[PDB]
Design an enzyme around this catalytic site. Structure first.
Site, short mmCIF file in Angstrom:
data_model
loop_
_atom_site.label_atom_id
_atom_site.label_comp_id
_atom_site.label_asym_id
_atom_site.label_seq_id
_atom_site.Cartn_x
_atom_site.Cartn_y
_atom_site.Cartn_z
N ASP A 37 34.48 36.13 39.10
CA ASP A 37 34.52 36.84 37.82
C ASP A 37 34.99 35.97 36.65
O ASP A 37 36.18 35.79 36.44
CB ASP A 37 35.41 38.08 37.94
CG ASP A 37 35.34 38.98 36.73
OD1 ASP A 37 34.49 38.74 35.85
OD2 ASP A 37 36.12 39.96 36.66
N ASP A 230 29.94 36.11 31.30
CA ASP A 230 30.67 36.93 32.29
C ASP A 230 29.92 37.16 33.60
O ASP A 230 29.06 38.04 33.69
CB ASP A 230 31.05 38.27 31.65
CG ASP A 230 31.91 39.13 32.56
OD1 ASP A 230 32.41 38.62 33.59
OD2 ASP A 230 32.12 40.32 32.23
N1 LIG Z 1 33.97 40.87 34.13
C1 LIG Z 1 34.42 42.03 34.63
N2 LIG Z 1 35.20 42.18 35.70
C2 LIG Z 1 35.66 43.56 35.79
C3 LIG Z 1 34.91 44.23 34.61
O1 LIG Z 1 34.27 43.16 33.90
C4 LIG Z 1 35.24 44.23 37.10
C5 LIG Z 1 33.90 44.11 37.55
C6 LIG Z 1 33.46 44.72 38.75
C7 LIG Z 1 32.10 44.58 39.10
C8 LIG Z 1 31.40 45.64 39.73
N3 LIG Z 1 30.09 45.59 40.05
C9 LIG Z 1 29.38 44.49 39.72
C10 LIG Z 1 29.98 43.39 39.06
CL1 LIG Z 1 29.02 42.03 38.65
C11 LIG Z 1 31.36 43.42 38.73
C12 LIG Z 1 34.37 45.50 39.52
C13 LIG Z 1 35.71 45.63 39.07
C14 LIG Z 1 36.15 45.01 37.87
O2 LIG Z 1 37.46 45.17 37.50
C15 LIG Z 1 37.81 44.92 36.14
C16 LIG Z 1 39.36 44.86 36.07
O3 LIG Z 1 39.73 44.50 34.74
C17 LIG Z 1 39.33 43.19 34.34
C18 LIG Z 1 37.78 43.13 34.29
C19 LIG Z 1 37.20 43.58 35.65
#
Ligand SMILES: NC1=N[C@@]2(CO1)c1cc(-c3cncc(Cl)c3)ccc1O[C@H]1COCC[C@@H]12
Ligand code: NI
Length: 400
Positions: A37, A230
């Site tokens: 991420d 991202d």
């Molecule tokens: N950058 C990004 N990361 C985030 C939100 O934005 C994320 C993404 C997924 C996630 C879920 N399904 C597909 C993908 Cl590619 C990612 C799942 C949980 C998740 O938690 C979020 C927690 O807070 C920071 C950003 C995080």
């Protein structure tokens, strides 16, 4: 170097559910699959039983675990994760041949964080300390890796998007190269755009075209209130005004077909009979990114093969069905997998820049390809960056 064979193909995932890398935590090493991420900055792993976890980090099994005696609470749009901060030994089995002591948030409770079927049990936040939780004093994993080893301060990502199966989602793959650039993963020129500020991987978009047609907006609109690269977002997400203009242009270019409103909202699939998808009715999308040189830009161009996501439906597995993966944002541009799957992307932290080159694995056809092209020169460029209003909350923070 120039070659990193052992790290190639170390990413896996299911379409739309993120790319993960195998990591080990603790002594002896406990294997977990971890979401890669670039849009967050915490290393956080499931550390208690959960309906969607087959396994989790067992702190008690690790002779090398240390409790930091501090909790962490991370709410967001879709839900929350929370847990206990600690440190332990961490390695990437299909990464560099090193072991480091990193901060680990042991996730004890969460809502709408884990995803049934994604096969990942944690998140690897690769962005900077500024956006770490609870605060910027919790050193992110990559910072610890660089400080404790001789690994160069750079990583690169080749995300390869997607069929064999109707019952499950399509498998995806890719590479995370830590410490260098693997020339087998791209073709043509590698173009760099500056990292505007080290928090998210923030960049500046100076122009947007849909099938060669300029959207003709004040360029600050493209970066309102930021533009980021991202890997932890599936879609290309665009600021409201930009989204609306883009959709209108794509609709007009593809007008021979009349899709439901649900499709353009990403809430409904559209299908064609196997192998008859009319790719040529859908336009290319070009994002011009600020160059390292003042008054220069370069463009990254993606195809409908990137922004139309394959989803094989059980009831109609004879057809090729797609989701429209450009969506509206209220927090700026997000260049997610829709963008990144076109390109080999170099996160050159050492030189405060992001590199784009055409990916050796990108999905294309015999007529068009994803492209990275430059330079484009502009006489007397306006500043396209947006300055986020400073809140009293933000202004009150001391940074010693
Ligand atoms: N950058 C990004 N990361 C985030 C939100 O934005 C994320 C993404 C997924 C996630 C879920 N399904 C597909 C993908 Cl590619 C990612 C799942 C949980 C998740 O938690 C979020 C927690 O807070 C920071 C950003 C995080
Ligand atoms: Ni002070």
């Amino acid at each position: 170097r120039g070659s990193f064979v052992e790290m190639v193909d170390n990413l896996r995932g299911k379409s739309g559910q993120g790319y993960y890398v195998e990591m080990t935590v603790g002594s002896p090493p406990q294997t977990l699959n971890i979401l890669v991420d670039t849009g967050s900055s915490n290393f956080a792993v499931g550390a208690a039983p959960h309906p969607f976890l087959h396994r989790y980090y067992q702190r008690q099994l690790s002779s090398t675990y240390r409790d930091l005696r501090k909790g962490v609470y991370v709410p967001y749009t879709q839900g929350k994760w929370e847990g206990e901060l600690g440190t332990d030994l961490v390695s990437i089995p299909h990464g560099p041949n090193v072991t480091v002591r990193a901060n680990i948030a042991a996730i004890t409770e969460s809502d709408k964080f884990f995803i049934n079927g994604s096969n990942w049990e944690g998140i690897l936040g690769l962005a900077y300390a500024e956006i770490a939780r609870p605060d910027d004093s919790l050193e992110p994993f990559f910072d610890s890796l660089v400080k404790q080893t001789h690994v160069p301060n750079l990583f690169s990502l080749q995300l390869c998007g997607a069929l064999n199966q109707s019952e499950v989602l399509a498998s995806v793959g890719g590479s995370m190269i830590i410490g260098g650039i693997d020339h087998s993963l791209y073709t043509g020129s590698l173009w760099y755009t500056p990292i505007r500020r080290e928090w998210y991987y923030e960049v500046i978009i100076v122009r947007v075209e849909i099938n060669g047609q300029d959207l003709k907006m004040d360029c600050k609109e493209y970066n309102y209130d930021k533009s980021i690269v991202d890997s932890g977002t599936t879609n290309l997400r665009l600021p409201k005004k930009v989204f609306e203009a883009a959709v209108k242009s794509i609709k007009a270019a593809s007008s021979t077909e009349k899709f439901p409103d649900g499709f353009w909202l990403g809430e409904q699939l559209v299908c064609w009979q196997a192998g008859t998808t009319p790719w040529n009715i859908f336009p290319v999308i070009s994002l011009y990114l600020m160059g390292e040189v003042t008054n220069q830009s370069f463009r990254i161009t993606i195809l409908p093969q990137q922004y139309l996501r394959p989803v094989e439906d059980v009831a109609t597995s004879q057809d090729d069905c797609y989701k429209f993966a450009i969506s509206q944002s209220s927090t700026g541009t997000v260049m997610g997998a829709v963008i990144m799957e076109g390109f080999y992307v170099v996160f050159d932290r050492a030189r405060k820049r992001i590199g784009f080159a055409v990916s050796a694995c990108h999905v294309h056809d015999e007529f068009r390809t994803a492209a990275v092209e430059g330079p484009f020169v502009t006489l007397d460029m306006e500043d396209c960056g947006y300055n986020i209003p400073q809140t009293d909350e933000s202004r009150s923070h001391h940074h010693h």
